[PDB]
Curated annotation (Swiss-Prot):
It comes from Escherichia phage Mu (Bacteriophage Mu). This is DDE-recombinase A. This enzyme is structurally similar to and performs the same endonucleotidic reaction as retroviral integrases, RNase H, RuvC holliday resolvases and RAG proteins. Induction: Expressed in the early phase of the viral replicative cycle. Expression of early genes is repressed by viral Repc (latency) and favored by viral Ner protein. Responsible for viral genome integration into the host chromosome. During integration of the incoming virus, DDE-recombinase A cleaves both viral DNA ends and the resulting 3'-OH perform a nucleophilic attack of the host DNA. The 5' flanking DNA attached to the ends of the viral genome (flaps) are resected by the DDE-recombinase A endonuclease activity, with the help of host chaperone ClpX. The gaps created in the host chromosome by the viral genome insertion are repaired by the host primary machinery for double-strand break repair. Responsible for replication of the viral genome by replicative transposition. During replicative transposition, DDE-recombinase A is part of the transpososome complex. DDE-recombinase A cleaves the viral DNA and the resulting 3'-OH performs a nucleophilic attack of the host DNA. The 5' flanking DNA is not resected and an intermediary structure is formed. This structure is resolved by target-primed replication leading to two copies of the viral genome (the original one and the copied one).
């Protein structure tokens, strides 16, 4: 769950990123909360060396979410810091612009 981890390395200011979250509506926070447990849980399934088809199908079976959607989101947050994922989930659907 979101808490208050110590701020260390800062190549880019992270407070600005969190500042937008603080201004996010309560409903938006709920959406990010819903997708944080599935992405972290999926990572654990991958380290077990389970087939991706079974790994994604099992999460989709336990979680009522589209398997294809979770797969796209998992790689998208890979380029972002692991702890800013809660803030990164405040973004709408994947950004079409890549740069």
């Amino acid at each position: 769950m979101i808490a208050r981890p110590t701020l260390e390395a800062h190549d880019y200011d992270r407070e600005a990123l969190w500042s937008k979250w603080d201004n996010a509506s309560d409903s938006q926070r709920r959406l990010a909360e819903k997708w944080l447990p599935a992405v972290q849980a999926a990572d654990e399934m991958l380290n077990q060396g389970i087939s991706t088809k079974t790994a994604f199908a099992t999460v989709a079976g336990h979680y009522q979410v589209s398997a294809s959607t979770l797969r796209d989101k998992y790689y998208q947050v890979q380029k972002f810091a692991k702890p800013d994922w809660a803030a990164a989930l405040v973004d709408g659907r994947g950004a079409s612009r890549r740069n």
